[PDB]
Write a protein that binds this ligand. Sequence first.
Ligand code: COA
Ligand code: COA
Ligand code: COA
Ligand code: CA
Lengths: 158, 157, 158
Amino acid sequence: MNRVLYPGTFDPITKGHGDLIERASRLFDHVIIAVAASPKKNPLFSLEQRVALAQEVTKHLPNVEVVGFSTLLAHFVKEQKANVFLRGLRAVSDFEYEFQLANMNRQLAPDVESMFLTPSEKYSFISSTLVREIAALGGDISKFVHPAVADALAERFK
Amino acid sequence: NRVLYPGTFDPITKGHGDLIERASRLFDHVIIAVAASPKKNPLFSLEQRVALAQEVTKHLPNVEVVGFSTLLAHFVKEQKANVFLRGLRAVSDFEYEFQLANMNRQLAPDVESMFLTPSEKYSFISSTLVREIAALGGDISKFVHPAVADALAERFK
Amino acid sequence: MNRVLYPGTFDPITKGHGDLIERASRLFDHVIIAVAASPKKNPLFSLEQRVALAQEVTKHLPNVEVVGFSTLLAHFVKEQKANVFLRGLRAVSDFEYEFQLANMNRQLAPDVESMFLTPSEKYSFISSTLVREIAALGGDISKFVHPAVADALAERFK
Ligand SMILES: CC(C)(COP(=O)(O)OP(=O)(O)OC[C@H]1O[C@@H](n2cnc3c(N)ncnc32)[C@H](O)[C@@H]1OP(=O)(O)O)[C@@H](O)C(=O)NCCC(=O)NCCS
Ligand SMILES: CC(C)(COP(=O)(O)OP(=O)(O)OC[C@H]1O[C@@H](n2cnc3c(N)ncnc32)[C@H](O)[C@@H]1OP(=O)(O)O)[C@@H](O)C(=O)NCCC(=O)NCCS
Ligand SMILES: CC(C)(COP(=O)(O)OP(=O)(O)OC[C@H]1O[C@@H](n2cnc3c(N)ncnc32)[C@H](O)[C@@H]1OP(=O)(O)O)[C@@H](O)C(=O)NCCC(=O)NCCS
Ligand SMILES: [Ca+2]
């Protein structure tokens, strides 16, 4: 009955995200990974590449699917008919941001719940941004991302 | 006591508005100092941000609005204000405000820095989130004054 | 045989940085100030200028030297044969970011320690960004930076 939507830029999706998704898949009947077009960031990967990578990482989860969107989250969730937003908390500064996003979404989409998970301690500290920067300088990122994602970063950077 | 409330106000929100109301009832003279903040790349021009702030505060006889592009520590002296007002709603706001205040204390030692918190009803409102939501056609009329809402509507088309 | 590497953008180096360097100098045999290119922050000063300013500020310390680098920190520190990273802490948001940086470097360079110092309270409130913005507006920053840095910032904005 619960359809949960996990929105993010996922540039690229990391094991941090992956941990939260494994856990959300075992908790909800239907999990939608919502990859946001985020042009105000100049994402390393195109929307289509980021959707593809997230699918690759979650294809073994039958109740998890991936979609891209460029519209307002509060609008888009209505198109997906999800009644729950999922957001991750890894740092105390995440909570502040998520707190204001949640209360703001509460005004725009009053019938959608905002819930949070924190990733396991092994998969905390993983920044999508730091993964990009490390990969860009030829550092090994295989401990932070799925092999398919690792392969994509390598190819992306020559 | 002449209080100066500096900010980008891009645009001014109900959070700012709450604090201004409260400061109006507390001080003889309240100056809203709208900073040209070129590095934030403001959605609204300085002139637009000043006009909106004026519109939102025109019912308050002891509150006036000025734009400035100069150093705050210099500008507050030109305005002859002896108090800075800044809002606090999140702890990351506090650290930044703490650091700005101790540095202004070095640049303007005779000026006091004080803080207010908006009511919980406006506590969660970010000017940034208001811009982004409006940019995507989300309704932001509950986060801002009617004149600001119109301005946001016209701003994107 | 402790060699400490202090990485940062230093755009420009401040009294905040200098305090940590003074202290690390009395604590370690060899102190390396690693100035990062950081092209993505679009630094006000070029890498060479930033190295030069750092050199000027630290020339009275016999066991301290300054180098520029554009490579992965985790690679560069091994290249320097340093066994310790030094990072400064002034606010809790720094701690969050540094905590996460330390844990990802620990994966990339497991034999390198991450240690932290906090500056004396007189220099704890000093931000290089704020120094830049104040100077760009013709404000006096001489109590926040060494004279050579003050002079360089003035020339930079005219
Ligand atoms: C939630 C949402 C609104 C904001 O996007 P976001 O949360 O900042 O992006 P993410 O969900 O991937 O999480 C933050 C990520 O962006 C990166 N990031 C953090 N701060 C950043 C900054 N100033 N600039 C660019 N990127 C940043 C980080 O790397 C972080 O990823 P990481 O934690 O894995 O390192 C977006 O997911 C969304 O759904 N947009 C739809 C638009 C909408 O409905 N409203 C606009 C305001 S709600
Ligand atoms: C102090 C000052 C630089 C910061 O701008 P500010 O608006 O007062 O501080 P902020 O309010 O931006 O801090 C966070 C808030 O702004 C938003 N915000 C902060 N940084 C932002 C950024 N880069 N981009 C977009 N939005 C931002 C957030 O939404 C948040 O909420 P709010 O806008 O509703 O108030 C500006 O007010 C000022 O007074 N400048 C004078 C310049 C000067 O004399 N010296 C420069 C160094 S002192
Ligand atoms: C990781 C790193 C960014 C940390 O160093 P650092 O934080 O920049 O060190 P500094 O004290 O000189 O600079 C800090 C300032 O940069 C600011 N800053 C951080 N990210 C920024 C960004 N994208 N854009 C602009 N300013 C930024 C911070 O707000 C901070 O401001 P403040 O100190 O005035 O308050 C980098 O400098 C480093 O030490 N090693 C990088 C190695 C690597 O991974 N790649 C190197 C290739 S260049
Ligand atoms: Ca600094």
